[PDB]
Amino acid sequence: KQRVFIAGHRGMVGSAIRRQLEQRGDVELVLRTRDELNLLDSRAVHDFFASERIDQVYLAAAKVGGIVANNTYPADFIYQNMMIESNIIHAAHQNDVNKLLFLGASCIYPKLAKQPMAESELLQGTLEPTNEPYAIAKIAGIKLCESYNRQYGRDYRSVMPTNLYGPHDNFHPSNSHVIPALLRRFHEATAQSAPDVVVWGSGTPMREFLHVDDMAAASIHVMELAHEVWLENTQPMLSHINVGTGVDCTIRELAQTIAKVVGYKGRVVFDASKPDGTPRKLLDVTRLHQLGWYHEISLEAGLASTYQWFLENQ
Amino acid sequence: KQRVFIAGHRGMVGSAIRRQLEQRGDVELVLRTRDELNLLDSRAVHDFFASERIDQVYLAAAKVGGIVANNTYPADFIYQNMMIESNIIHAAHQNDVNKLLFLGASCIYPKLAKQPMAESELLQGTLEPTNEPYAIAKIAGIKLCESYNRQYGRDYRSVMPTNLYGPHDNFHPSNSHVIPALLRRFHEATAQSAPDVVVWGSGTPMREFLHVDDMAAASIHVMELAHEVWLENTQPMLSHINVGTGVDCTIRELAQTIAKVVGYKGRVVFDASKPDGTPRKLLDVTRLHQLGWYHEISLEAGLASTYQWFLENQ
Ligand SMILES: NC(=O)c1ccc[n+]([C@@H]2O[C@H](COP(=O)([O-])OP(=O)(O)OC[C@H]3O[C@@H](n4cnc5c(N)ncnc54)[C@H](OP(=O)(O)O)[C@@H]3O)[C@@H](O)[C@H]2O)c1
Ligand SMILES: NC(=O)c1ccc[n+]([C@@H]2O[C@H](COP(=O)([O-])OP(=O)(O)OC[C@H]3O[C@@H](n4cnc5c(N)ncnc54)[C@H](OP(=O)(O)O)[C@@H]3O)[C@@H](O)[C@H]2O)c1
């Protein structure tokens, strides 16, 4: 069996990968909570790699937050993510761990990227200010992987997820992530028999959403492709792979679909006196499709299962 | 007196800053060689800051090299520079060091930046591949400074030097840095009475060069400006300041001037069957000039003093 360390295993993405791999008789999972292993402590990280046996790492540990967090604690988001990724990638290499999968984030493409965004949009222009610190840290992670690949012949691969949703998300009404926020707002409006739920903006902007169990499946798929096949579909200095559906939906359709999922019978209202973001933001997932992976969970089906997980975990 | 830690003090830039500050009765320098303090070791760095007294840091420690090095050891250039900058900036903040000056590099602007390159060119397009790993690490340093500024009200300022030359450079004929390489090639051609010295390319591309003692003076000037003045001439998320002459010279003029400086009497030859890089690469130094600093060392005068330092240190 391969010894697989899922860093950040209790996280949203990390836990999704753990749910799938825990089903695998060819895999022995190695897991440490933050209390058992602080990924910011280089010495602790190195000791762990020097004693445990690892064959593969899924790097799903990060300091992640929403709009308010990223603008309020910028130093924490750049420093913590630089150190976690630096520590794990370095310790992995020093201990002859040849395989690693790093997680990027789609909010780290340029603010004014061409749509849909192919992998080559990376670094082609300036970042969204709210996410800049976190995005720079994330881009440095991808470049640490590529540099260890090129210098030492490692196999440190990287995925770039689109917007994610699903179990283990933060279902609080003031989350800046539209999925979990609207599920919870709609839930409470339906409980209260509120006449309407108002959403800022016009509802015309198109966005792309992927259920975290699809993310996890794609991540495992990418990790386990033969190296030669991964090479034929990437370049050493443009190595990441977008993970998403490649399909857009309006904020209006999303909200209306959430309302239906939850059984709300009041009115979804958009307040178009509030500004809209860019008209369209989505990944181009041609490389992932060429690599033989296609998402399985439709929006309707994913929102319904997600909402059921919330009901079970209030 | 202010307690000033010059990280990397034996380096080219670090030593230039030390030569100027060692003349200052208002400054107590705190210096540690690599053997006394490995800047890659977070615990050692933190212990140093927790015991020494620091009021200001000049962050002039780095893993730096030329074209071959950056392409041959990419992981060393991204990881080492990420860790050194992360360790020092974090430890400085944790120990209430409010003032820091970080050194960037002009090779970290986009390959196809608009010329002359204003500070706002940063992150506006893709990087030169040879320098990408190092440039990403350097950009992450500037963003660590800006994030600590914004989150914690620190005063971590950053300069972006143009091409540098001067004492303590690497005067070896195969250095990819044109200044030191040509000084040494011309020196040896003059010693050998070689009939000609051939330089690859046409000699038409324009570049910008600054003597390291000017760099050091500008760095000290920027560090010591009143905060309110530094604020009026920067933005929190576009905080760095280009340091250079803002003036171009052809590779042809540079080589011809070196030849004269050294007293070569053979022929400078350009081989235009070899490719030229971009036609023009230089910084826009309007912010530094507005901040009241202008370079003092002409190319002719700087090359002559540099060459004299080489003669004294063969
Ligand atoms: N659409 C997108 O762009 C998108 C969305 C989601 C995720 N992602 C990718 O997936 C990554 C993970 O996202 P996520 O939502 O799964 O994060 P999370 O799920 O919210 O948390 C990841 C975790 O890693 C752990 N961790 C953080 N710092 C640690 C440390 N110093 N030591 C040990 N463990 C530490 C956390 O511990 P404690 O949490 O308990 O503090 C948390 O369990 C993101 O950063 C991104 O790269 C991309
Ligand atoms: N035109 C440009 O873009 C340009 C040119 C030059 C410099 N610069 C700026 O100035 C920075 C310094 O350049 P430089 O030429 O002065 O470099 P250097 O001068 O060649 O070296 C800097 C030094 O820091 C030290 N150091 C490196 N790693 C260390 C570690 N782990 N612990 C302790 N000390 C460590 C080095 O030690 P050991 O060397 O003895 O290995 C070396 O003395 C550059 O990285 C750049 O940011 C910009």
Question: What is the identity of the amino acid at B60?
Answer: A
Q: How far is the CA of B84 from the centre of ligand 2 (A)?
A: 11
HEC readout, chain A: CEEEEEECCCCHHHHHHHHHHCCCCCEEEECCCCCCCCCCCHHHHHHHHHHHCCCEEEECCCCCCCHHHHHHCHHHHHHHHHHHHHHHHHHHHHCCCCEEEEECCHHHCCCCCCCCECHHHCCCCCCCCCCHHHHHHHHHHHHHHHHHHHHHCCEEEEEEECEEECCCCCCCCCCCCHHHHHHHHHHHHHHHCCCEEEEECCCCCEECEEEHHHHHHHHHHHHHCCHHHHHHCCECCECCEEECCCCCEEHHHHHHHHHHHHCCCCEEEEECCCCCCCCECCECCHHHHHCCCCCCCCHHHHHHHHHHHHHHCC
How far is residue B274's CA from residue B284's CA, in Å, rounded to a whole number? 29
Using alpha carbons only, what angle is made at residue A41 by residues A40 and A43, rounded to the nearest 5 degrees? 150
Cβ within 8 Å, pair A133-B126:
no
Longest dimension (CA), chain A: 61
List the single best residue of B143, B158, B238 to mutate versus A (max A Cβ within 10 A): B143
Chain B residues lying within 8 Å of A93, measured CB to CB: 75
B307 given a catalytic annotation: no
How far is residue A63's CA from residue A105's CA, in Å, rounded to a whole number? 12
Alpha-carbon dihedral sign for residues A302, A113, A204, A131: positive
Residues in chain A, overall count: 314
Q: B161 to each of A136, A150, B6, B211, B250, how far by Cα in Å?
A: 21, 28, 17, 10, 19
What experiment produced this structure? X-ray
List the single best residue of A108, A136, A148, A235 to mutate versus B (max B Cβ within 10 A): A136
Ramachandran bin of B25, using left for φ above 0, alpha for ψ from -120 to 50, beta for the remaining angles = alpha
Nearest Cβ partner for B129 among A90, A151, A237 = A237
Question: What is the identity of the amino acid at A30?
Answer: V
A-B contacts (CB, under 8 Å): 93
How far is residue A285's CA from residue A246's CA, in Å, rounded to a whole number? 5
Is A248 an interface residue toward B (CB < 8 Å)?
Answer: no
First to last CA, chain B: 37
Of B270, B74, B251, B231, nearest to B153 by C-alpha is B231
Resolution in A: 1.6
Do A101 and A57 meet the contact criterion of CB atoms below 8 Å apart?
yes
The number of angstroms, rounded, from the C-alpha of A204 to the middle of its chain's C-alpha atoms is 24
Of B8, B6, B7, B12, nearest to B309 by C-alpha is B12
| 3-class DSSP assignment, residue B267 | strand
Using alpha carbons only, what angle is made at residue A198 by residues A196 and A199, rounded to the nearest 5 degrees? 145
How far is residue A157's CA from residue A218's CA, in Å, rounded to a whole number? 12
CA dihedral A227, A149, B145, B291 (to 10 degrees): -120
Q: Which residues contact A139 (CB under 8 A, 6 or more apart)?
A: A104, A108, A122, A123, B136
For chain A, which domains are there? 1-165+208-246+282-297 (3.40.50.720), 166-207+247-281+298-314 (3.90.25.10)
User: Tokens 């003036």 sit at which residue?
Assistant: B247
Is A93 an interface residue toward B (CB < 8 Å)?
Answer: yes
